[PDB]
Amino acid sequence: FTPRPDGSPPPEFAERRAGAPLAPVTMPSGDEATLAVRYADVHEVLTSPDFSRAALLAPEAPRILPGEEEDPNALTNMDPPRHTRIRRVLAGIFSPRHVKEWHPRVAAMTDELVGAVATGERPVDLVETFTLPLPIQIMCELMGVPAADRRKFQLWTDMIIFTAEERIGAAGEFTGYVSELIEGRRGTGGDALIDALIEAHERLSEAELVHLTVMLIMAGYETTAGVLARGLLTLLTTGQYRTLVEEPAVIPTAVEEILRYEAPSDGGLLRMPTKDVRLPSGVVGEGQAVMPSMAAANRDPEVFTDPETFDVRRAKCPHLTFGQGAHYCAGANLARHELQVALETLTRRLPDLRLAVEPTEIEWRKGLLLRGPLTVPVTW
Amino acid sequence: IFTPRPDGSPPPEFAERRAGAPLAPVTMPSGDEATLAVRYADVHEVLTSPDFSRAALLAPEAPRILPGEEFGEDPNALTNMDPPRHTRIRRVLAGIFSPRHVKEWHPRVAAMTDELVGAVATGERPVDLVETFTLPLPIQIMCELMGVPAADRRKFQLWTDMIISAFTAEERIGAAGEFTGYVSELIEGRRGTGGDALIDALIEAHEDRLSEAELVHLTVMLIMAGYETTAGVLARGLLTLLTTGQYRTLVEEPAVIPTAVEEILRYEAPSDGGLLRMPTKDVRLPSGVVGEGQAVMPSMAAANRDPEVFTDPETFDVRRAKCPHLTFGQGAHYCAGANLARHELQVALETLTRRLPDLRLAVEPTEIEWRKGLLLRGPLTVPVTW
């Protein structure tokens, strides 16, 4: 909520998990909601059918931040049955067995960027040169987007967390660019992600395809960049980077542990109960919105032994960083793969990587909910 | 012969030399002379015979085409080598550029075509097909194959324009050193990343073979050749399609595309000339004997319009069945990227005729301007609408 100078959780989480599992919290908007922090409460909030996303569009419902965007055609603001139809299409697209035509593009973009880091001026900022551009360049290649337009996609997303009409403006260039992009691509015989989306509209409405495309690009850039910058910074400060260099087989569990520990937001999309719901820690009333804090759930000693310790070898790691239930992250398999190949390539090409400053000098983004370091200087 | 022409039509000297003066002197831009072979039978022989040398053109007293350069005088350029070294590097190139490896790059060709036609399709009309399609398509593929950051694409393109040749100066020496340097740094970065692109395959050929200087210069050359030659031929190819209306034949009958690719290669050969061959003793060509130490220019474009080989050679016909052209050269130096090039041209036409069937020249044929200077010929723009 209030800017922290590092990636330390707010201590109000541990307090709420101990004795105030389902208490009000006042959000940046000034409105309040019940904050669920215990794993089991968050699990239930994310899986139960008795909560609605679409109800948060109603004019009286509470908001997390001040403003609009709040789009009625965004996947995150829909309920069954509409919601279910678009997800069926997305499983058909992000077929875990269609990733195979896509793995090479991920590795190629990593090799590209790690090479550039490798011959760059030390000390290098790993954010600007690696962690920020890797996911945007990946999403762009998969959407058949000219590399000349990637910086523009980055700024529109950054703008769309900037003051109302400036955010409507930037949403309007993205939607417009994307619909145009689409018109161009219809009729080519393509096999990229953008192509599979287009061809699902011949099950997706016009505005559905456009907004889904926009969201896939935004979703798959900001979160991954966040998690990866954070993950690398923890690897470097704990010295667990070296563990991955010496034992590359540990990279899978490291990815999971980074997801758990580095969950980029402390908050979550509100859920509205459509009737009185019993969660494990208590009953929450109909019409009283709940915030699921997956970040808090991820550091719950009921589930994770020694929750505040970062351990790349952690075997039991059912984190909620991809959410859960129906809104479970659509790009979960791509993201996990991006993270693995990122760590694989970087530890292979630069084993003797190390932070070029002390942790406490690194600055973190202030405001905009999502938390992450502003720069990660390294040398070797 | 490389003097200004307002279009892509051949020098009429070609028809007269083929008629009555097959192996006659020609003066080159440099001021120096060579024998100009124009008949298909002579050009074939000049390219395939083991009695001609490329390397001997490096000797300081040998004739040159251009008046001063670096990259073409480079001893480590594949085009400036004879067996056995030439053979070593070629077999490395065969183990990289195999028919199988090209079939495993296919999606990346299609994807860059897909991208760029889509942007053609949505462009403000009339769209210049050169700037939006023919120029970027192959440079962007090559760069993708070499792990080159997309921001670095125009640098590669301008450099390659300088080494091709007025725009001539001692600048085609400064360009070589910037490309060479950039590429060496690209290599440094890339060794140890474990990628599966072309540039990785070249590096893993050096490591335990290709020398450092061979690797560097070959990578630079693969970048320049895979862009400038393909770019020109494709632009030329599309322009002839549109001006003949044979574009429509391909839209209505896509199975014609392969013969169209060959006929484009034949008719649109981007050069009037070719790299000098030095005979290493007296050689009897079909049209006459050439003297030891007397250089011959093989004009593959003249050969391609020889009425002894090709009926109605000045007619462009996408249905003409297999008649070996020489646009890829012949013999030992036969173009190493030939199969990527044919594939790039086949996909460009497959994609572009599918997306924009009713494409048409936005201007009169004769209104188009052609690149001046350079050893390649090609139109500056190809404006179109639909």
Ligand code: HEM
């Ligand atoms: C490490 C990176 C990522 C994290 C931490 C992450 C996390 C999440 C989370 C937690 C949600 C659910 C939100 C909620 O229910 O409150 C979500 C939804 C979503 N994710 Fe992400 N994501 C990541 C990467 C990606 C990628 C690469 C894509 C795109 C391919 C993507 C696309 C989506 C979409 C479309 C949704 C909305 C799904 C729905 O509402 O049904 N994610 N993501």
Ligand code: HEM
């Ligand atoms: C339409 C496309 C192309 C044309 C018209 C073309 C033409 C030629 C010709 C005629 C030669 C031989 C010159 C001589 O023997 O004097 C040659 C050499 C060569 N080409 Fe091309 N080429 C094209 C595309 C490519 C591509 C895509 C590559 C890139 C990988 C490439 C790489 C090379 C190399 C490395 C050589 C030198 C081989 C040697 O000297 O042994 N070419 N090309």
Ligand SMILES: C/C=C(\C)[C@H]1C/C=C/C=C(\C)CC[C@@H](O)[C@@](C)(O)C(=S)/C=C2\N[C@@](C)(C3=N[C@@H](CS3)C(=O)O1)[C@@H](O)S2
């Ligand atoms: C410009 C040629 C490139 C980029 C490559 C590869 C293969 C092309 C051969 C073709 C298309 C045939 C004609 C070509 O030989 C000619 C006469 O047009 C040219 S362009 C001749 C010369 N060019 C220079 C700049 C170089 N060619 C070699 C090494 S540098 C090269 O890169 O070939 C001069 O040496 S002479």
